[PDB]
């Protein structure tokens, strides 16, 4: 009965942690935008999210065509895919992360709803062994992991107490610490001694007694939980991709992915927001390939991927399937968008449809006010179109007006007009097929707002590598 997309959080208001889609065909992007909006996620945060196929263990590229009834049996989760370790800035041993600030706040990576979704997703991955007890060897590491997992289960229940507005003791009786710890630790407890069970129960009941009502807020419990999860789980917020073949090649010595007239994994390629692209064979050490800003393009031919660096060196990869190659290319392309270029994509095979449209129609992403001002200020008659920073389906046509700030010093006043979709500008009797068509008609015309007039002389276009709040700066 339709495509059921699973949620880790239903957003404010709540309800069923899923969204069912009945439309004959939809893109993965349309799905994510619809869900992001329902959950309260804002437009500057939309591109952090993607759809994960939990059974096939692949993510969908944003141009993936979902079809109903054909895909009614797919098990998909809506999740944060693009992650920056230490974004909260709680580990001093690693750099900070922020959105570009105004020229010469809006610098925070996440909005309130993206943070709460991240926390709910983190709890799911934690319980699902993103950090396994089995991966440990020494008594010191095992003891630390168990004690930390109990502290995490304590934070999990404290949050629930605050969220539902009930004391910690009534939460502790409805929810067990065993349901808030990694599954590998839960299995360990069950298989081990009855006296060890009694002891862990008493250690946890003690953790509950050292709780102070009014000491911490819901937000502080969440940040600490997430920051502890990062410390416990080095794999959390990262992706390790298995490949069947891996080669490094210099371009002026051969063509990669060449058409010629699958096997067990030989390597893993690691991709992280703060560390770029690394690899290792399956004594172990991650070799470094490049950062996202070093990539010129990515070539995808069947299940074969080629990552091209500016110096013409290539990382050639054979993935287990076409769906695995599309998952992988959309991971590299998604981090490239966030760290290097808001208005470019590395491979047409996985390009976000809303971005392809934006590039051809000369539309900017959800830019904050100081970035649009820096674009309109050079000349009179300048204008631009950008996606709204609050509304997912609204475009903003913007002009700058002569104004006088307090002191008598000449200032700049912005006038914002909405374009809605068959794109229509609110106040103009015409209707257009594309925004490029609506913008081409706009060229040379005169805009009237109250008693003021504005010459629509030139449309500012997105420039390659230009900094804005859409760019994520790695400290």
């Amino acid at each position: 009965g339709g495509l059921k997309v699973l949620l880790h959080w239903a957003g404010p208001g709540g309800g069923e942690p899923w969204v069912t889609f009945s439309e004959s065909s939809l893109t993965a992007e349309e799905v994510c935008i619809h869900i992001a909006h329902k959950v309260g996620i804002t437009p500057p945060c939309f591109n952090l999210f993607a759809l994960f196929d939990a059974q096939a263990q692949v993510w969908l590229p944003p141009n993936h065509i979902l079809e109903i009834p054909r895909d009614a049996s797919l098990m998909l989760y809506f999740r944060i895919r693009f992650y920056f370790r230490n974004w909260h800035g709680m580990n001093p041993r690693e750099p900070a992360v922020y959105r570009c600030g105004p020229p010469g706040q809006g610098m925070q990576l996440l909005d309130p709803a993206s943070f709460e979704y991240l926390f709910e997703q983190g709890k799911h991955e934690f319980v699902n062994d993103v950090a396994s007890l089995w991966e440990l060897s020494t008594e010191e590491e095992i003891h630390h992991f168990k004690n930390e997992s109990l502290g995490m289960a304590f934070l999990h229940l404290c949050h629930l107490a605050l969220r539902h507005g009930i004391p910690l003791e009534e939460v502790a009786k409805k929810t067990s610490f065993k349901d808030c710890i990694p599954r590998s630790f839960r299995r360990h407890i069950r298989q081990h001694s009855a006296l060890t069970r009694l002891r862990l129960r008493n250690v946890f009941r003690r953790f509950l007694r050292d709780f102070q009502p009014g000491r911490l807020s819901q937000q502080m419990v969440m940040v600490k939980y997430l920051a502890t999860l990062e410390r416990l789980a080095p794999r959390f917020g990262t992706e390790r991709v298995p490949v069947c073949h891996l080669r490094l090649l210099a371009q002026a010595e051969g063509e990669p992915c060449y058409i010629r007239d699958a096997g067990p994994p030989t390597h893993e390629v690691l991709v992280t927001g703060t560390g770029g692209i690394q690899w290792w064979p399956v004594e172990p050490l991650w070799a470094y390939f490049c950062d996202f800003r070093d990539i010129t393009h990515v070539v995808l031919k069947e299940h074969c991927v080629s990552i091209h660096r500016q110096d013409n060196k290539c990382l050639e990869l054979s993935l287990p399937s076409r769906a695995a190659a599309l998952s992988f290319v959309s991971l590299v392309d998604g981090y490239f968008r966030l760290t290097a270029d808001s208005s470019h994509y590395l491979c047409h095979e996985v390009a976000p449809p809303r971005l392809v449209m934006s590039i051809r129609d000369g539309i900017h992403g959800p830019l904050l006010e100081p970035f649009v001002q820096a674009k309109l200020r050079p000349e009179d008659g300048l204008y631009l179109i950008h996606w709204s920073t609050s509304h997912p389906y609204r475009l903003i046509l913007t002009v700058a007006q002569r104004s006088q700030a307090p002191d008598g010093m000449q200032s700049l006043r912005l006038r914002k007009f909405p374009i809605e979709q068959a794109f229509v500008l609110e106040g103009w009797g015409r209707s257009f097929p594309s925004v490029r068509e609506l913008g081409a008609a706009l060229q040379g015309c005169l805009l009237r707002a109250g008693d003021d007039c504005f010459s629509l002389r030139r449309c500012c276009l997105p420039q390659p590598g230009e900094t804005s709040n859409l760019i994520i700066m790695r400290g």
Binding site: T42, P44, C45, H88, Q105, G106, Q108, L109, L110, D111, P112, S114, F115, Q219, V223, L368, E369, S388, T389, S390, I396, L397, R415, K416, F417, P418, L425, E426, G427, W428, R430, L442, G444, C445, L446, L447, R448, A449, C453
Partner: peptide, 19 residues
Amino acid sequence: NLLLSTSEEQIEKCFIIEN
């Protein structure tokens, strides 16, 4: 502080003169 503040555009009613 930790999180992205809301930013809604104040939008206005248009009128276009052609040629």
